[PDB]
Ligand binder design. Sequence first.
Ligand SMILES: Nc1nc2c(ncn2[C@@H]2O[C@H](COP(=O)(O)OP(=O)(O)OP(=O)(O)O)[C@@H](O)[C@H]2O)c(=O)[nH]1
Ligand SMILES: Nc1ncnc2c1ncn2[C@@H]1O[C@H](COP(=O)(O)OP(=O)(O)CP(=O)(O)O)[C@@H](O)[C@H]1O
Ligand SMILES: COc1cc(C(=O)c2cccc(-c3ccc(C)c(O)c3)n2)cc(OC)c1OC
Ligand SMILES: Nc1nc2c(ncn2[C@@H]2O[C@H](COP(=O)(O)OP(=O)(O)O)[C@@H](O)[C@H]2O)c(=O)[nH]1
Ligand SMILES: [Ca+2]
Ligand SMILES: [Ca+2]
Ligand SMILES: [Mg+2]
Ligand SMILES: [Mg+2]
Lengths: 424, 437, 309, 53
Amino acid sequence: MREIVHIQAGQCGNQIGAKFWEVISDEHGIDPTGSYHGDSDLQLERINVYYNEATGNKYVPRAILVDLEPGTMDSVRSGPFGQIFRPDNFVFGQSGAGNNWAKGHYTEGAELVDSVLDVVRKESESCDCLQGFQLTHSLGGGTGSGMGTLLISKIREEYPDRIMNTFSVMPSPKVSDTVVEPYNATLSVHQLVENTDETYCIDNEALYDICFRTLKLTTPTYGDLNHLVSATMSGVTTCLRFPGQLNADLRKLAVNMVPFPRLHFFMPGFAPLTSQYRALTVPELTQQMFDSKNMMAACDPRHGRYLTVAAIFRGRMSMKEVDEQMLNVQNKNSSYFVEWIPNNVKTAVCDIPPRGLKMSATFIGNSTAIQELFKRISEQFTAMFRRKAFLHWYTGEGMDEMEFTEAESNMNDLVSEYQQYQDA
Amino acid sequence: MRECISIHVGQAGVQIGNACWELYCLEHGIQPDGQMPSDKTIGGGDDSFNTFFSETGAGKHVPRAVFVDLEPTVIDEVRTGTYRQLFHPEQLITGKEDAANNYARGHYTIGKEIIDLVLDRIRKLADQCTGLQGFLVFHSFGGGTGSGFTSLLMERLSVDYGKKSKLEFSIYPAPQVSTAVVEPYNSILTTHTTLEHSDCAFMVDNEAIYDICRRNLDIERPTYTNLNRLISQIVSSITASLRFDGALNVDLTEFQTNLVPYPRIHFPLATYAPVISAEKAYHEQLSVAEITNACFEPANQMVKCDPRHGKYMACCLLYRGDVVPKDVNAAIATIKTKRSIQFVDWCPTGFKVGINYQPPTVVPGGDLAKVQRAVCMLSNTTAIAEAWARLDHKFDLMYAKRAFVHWYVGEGMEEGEFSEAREDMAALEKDYEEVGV
Amino acid sequence: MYTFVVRDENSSVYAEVSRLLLATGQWKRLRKDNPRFNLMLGERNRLPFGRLGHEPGLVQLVNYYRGADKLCRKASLVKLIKTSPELSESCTWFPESYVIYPGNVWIAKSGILISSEAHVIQKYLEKPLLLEPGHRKFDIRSWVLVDHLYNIYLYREGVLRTSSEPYNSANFQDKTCHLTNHCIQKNYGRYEEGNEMFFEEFNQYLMDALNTTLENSILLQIKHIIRSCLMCIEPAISTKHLHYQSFQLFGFDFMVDEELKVWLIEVNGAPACAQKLYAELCQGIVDVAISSVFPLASIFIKLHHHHHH
Amino acid sequence: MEVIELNKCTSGQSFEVILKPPDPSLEEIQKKLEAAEERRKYQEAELLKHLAE
Ligand SMILES: Nc1nc2c(ncn2[C@@H]2O[C@H](COP(=O)(O)OP(=O)(O)OP(=O)(O)O)[C@@H](O)[C@H]2O)c(=O)[nH]1
Ligand SMILES: Nc1ncnc2c1ncn2[C@@H]1O[C@H](COP(=O)(O)OP(=O)(O)CP(=O)(O)O)[C@@H](O)[C@H]1O
Ligand SMILES: COc1cc(C(=O)c2cccc(-c3ccc(C)c(O)c3)n2)cc(OC)c1OC
Ligand SMILES: Nc1nc2c(ncn2[C@@H]2O[C@H](COP(=O)(O)OP(=O)(O)O)[C@@H](O)[C@H]2O)c(=O)[nH]1
Ligand SMILES: [Ca+2]
Ligand SMILES: [Ca+2]
Ligand SMILES: [Mg+2]
Ligand SMILES: [Mg+2]
């Protein structure tokens, strides 16, 4: 289990997806033409996980770029690392999806999906041992949301024994394109609950607040938010991308993080928050990574309990200090970690730090506090759905009201399920 | 002589195998290429060391070893490492995909497709043996391969080699050393399924070894290399009597007879002194009294527990170095008066002593200092049930909520196998208490 | 912030040690089943000692000594004294006791029988010391705190659990004058409040009626008995060099006979204090047994005597 | 304290010292492995049926 196939879908999917490849290609010393110009051997020992080796000692991202309009993907090709992607893996329709889940899932996306799958199969075929897939997308638009979850469903049919992973950006009125986002996210969450093993919940509310409050950026662009997303993505993929101690893969992560199959929605976080000169002491990293102000999902971890936790430290530091500090928060905040899963916090260290920082920490929590995210979207949904407002956009693409009622129920179930274990 | 096959399942098994075979090679004067200059019978023999090594016409000495892992990375470091010429490639067996810390995946799913291959490579070694005793099996309780594939091997080894003895070296899981959350489940499952198939099993709690490395080797944050090098000294002690001239514990059957009167209660507590740092400039060498006395201190045990609140069924003292019988008996006389050493009423209060005059060998550049004399006590105390209770409690906590269970069921395993395995462990805890109070 | 759990709700003593710790602002109480504690305040039966001291990063302490039940049950207390050389079968301060399973006056106990006809049969002290005015039996309760280092701390205040019925040689079946237990009595408080004479008053009686002191006539023999009993079992129960540590409050029960000779009756593993003394004793447990291991931001007498021979 | 059964050699010696006197078959394994492969392949069928819907 080494190779991963990366898929990025829609405006948001391709934007954050493009930053991920910029960030991680700099860490593995791959330039914008695909040539290695690094210094350590540790940069290339697990390069197979995300890149294929081509003729002339080039590295090509195992990346499939999907959209239902050409705009964003043309920006990616024009952009700084655009030339590194395999040109055959740009798969794109022309008419767009108009921020409509139904267009993505049932009509426009249907027309395009089989050709995405042909590239997925192509990339899969030349993998020695495929461990699974990761998708970058939002749940608030139409392509990444609707088509993205169509793909997920299809990939599960063809590769039922491989791991499905998502970086799923959740919508918020603070960072909002259209009023139908709550509908699009509720239809997608139902898909994610059934058809994925792990989902990183990036809430745009939380990214905005981090940019506003805890970084002093008065007017945040999507690029400012996507700086935070790409840094977290680098964070959570560290163990996959460098050696080593725990032979780290998607399945082992899934087995240990997910005590109940539906509850696989993780609350990622990063320390230190950037946009520095002083390096953080190991106590500070440990305080900050566990701090609400550093979480990428707008939930108070104090309103729930941790089922499982995975913390990944990056840089040259005393592991003695790390273990003491990691034991200090568990023993000083012990009510917030469930007693019925012994030793639920798992710590890992990697010697190489990310660009810019001397040391850093990535947090991955399966907290029952995530319910707040789903309740927030369930309320925004019901506000509109009780008056059947904006439904014509979907019913015009063949969907029934029944399908909305179902998704509403399936999400409120998810919320009940998280509540069961927060009091248990 | 009678040949012994060592089997190393999983990462923990394999890396501990590496450590042991490195040490054995140093002890018998066998080199990385596999030549043994001090051997005069070229091409063969029936010396005590031949129980663990076969020989070839060109003079190579070859471990009676099978390394089995469901993924290649760890055994690939044996294939490319210091002792690459030592093993025949057919002894080193790897899969493609590990068991993701899942008993069921190791036992049922990925086990089924590889069990026949491994038994075949085991048969290739059993056919080179004039009179096979049986097997030493090394594994973790926590790993999926270590828990799951081991238990299926132990099932099949009972069928194909019903006459032969099976000893375990088992690594019990510890939060302080790369534990996953599901290892308590894995530990109970494999313990249940392996219980009837194992004659004598030596548990090594990673917690105990880790603190020994902190306290006595001054190692801030012990690595697997530190832990394994130390575990292999305890292993060498225990297997010394199979590989060297002597009259205590000369075959695998004797380990069962001397240490295991009640067949289910077959987990002897190992205790080991002295453990001393090679970076320590000034060290006053410890005596026979002081190291025999160190055998009754919990801080030196392979599992932390309190023998004073339990009862002994058997006690062996295996000395390595400058020791003579009268020094041992004088130390035993002193210690009996000071400490609480209660035996069961149906067993003779006593000690079977084994002394080998060659002091312990140390790996050059290792963490352990050379010592004039050392000892490994093997005592079958009921105190070791303390470890079963801890492990059982963690299982109960998670299993009350059905936490993680779906991953096991998803590999074809029935939910009932959990509570079944836990009932055997409930019976096991009760056996210890009857015998012990 | 140190942490503790509570697993005995009946414990009058550790109820107060629980409340004193919380009201320091430096000790959080956790749930009964939370493994991540510095201090257990454990159960009486089935206390899970095998789970203690295996929590990385916590130093764990508990208010019971595993193995201390051997001194605290009646059946095994007799068996301890008959078998150990350091308190021989010719032990002068223990009433001649025997064990058979289910002046020649005896007593049976584990519902108490006193006759010559009729678990443990014990020599009944026919000629006990009698406090006047009253002509009445009493027993002395001494509180002992053994800390993690095995320092034996005797609390300076004890109590006489008195009777209030004249003692009788011919009449055994009447239990109120022979058995001096606080529960069995409730003349309940005629001579002293609640049948409780504290050490200051009892010292003065001895000075007046007997021309001696509490320290000389009785308390030296108590200190010898406590120290003889605890040093006997130290190898079996000491938590020096162990992965968790233990302390324990013990309650020693004594009888003083006519010629001022002190006799051990029972050692009590989970003792209740006396109503007045809770305040001072429970604070001393905290100072000496708990805060020594877990320091924050003398009421005892230490028992030790290395005589050379 | 009696020191019995003393045996010696050049590499060591050994003795005892007393202070006081007093399986399922190949069919059934391949069976219940295959019973778990059925439940595995049943679960995969209910998935591929649910996806066909
Ligand atoms: N003492 C020691 N323990 C180890 C070693 N490697 C792993 N462990 C322990 O074994 C448990 C994990 O099991 P492993 O043996 O690594 O797993 P595996 O058997 O390879 O199984 P999968 O990876 O699940 O296929 C944990 O308790 C680890 O601390 C080692 O080299 N020495
Ligand atoms: N050998 C003896 N001689 C005189 N009196 C005796 C005696 N044995 C017992 N008693 C009396 O019987 C009473 C109760 O007996 P005992 O002290 O054995 O039980 P107990 O369990 O109630 C003490 P506690 O519960 O306070 O620890 C004592 O107060 C004592 O006066
Ligand atoms: C995909 O990135 C990660 C992978 C892993 C693992 O592969 C892994 C292996 C063994 C055990 C665990 C684990 C994970 C979580 C918990 C709560 C646990 O008890 C064990 N994981 C691990 C990661 O985090 C350290 C990864 O994130 C980068
Ligand atoms: N964090 C982040 N969110 C985005 C970005 N682009 C769009 N979004 C969010 O994604 C949703 C709109 O979906 P979008 O990806 O544009 O639609 P699609 O192209 O049809 O999938 C809204 O909630 C936006 O706030 C981005 O670059 N970063
Ligand atoms: Ca069309
Ligand atoms: Ca030879
Ligand atoms: Mg848009
Ligand atoms: Mg492994």
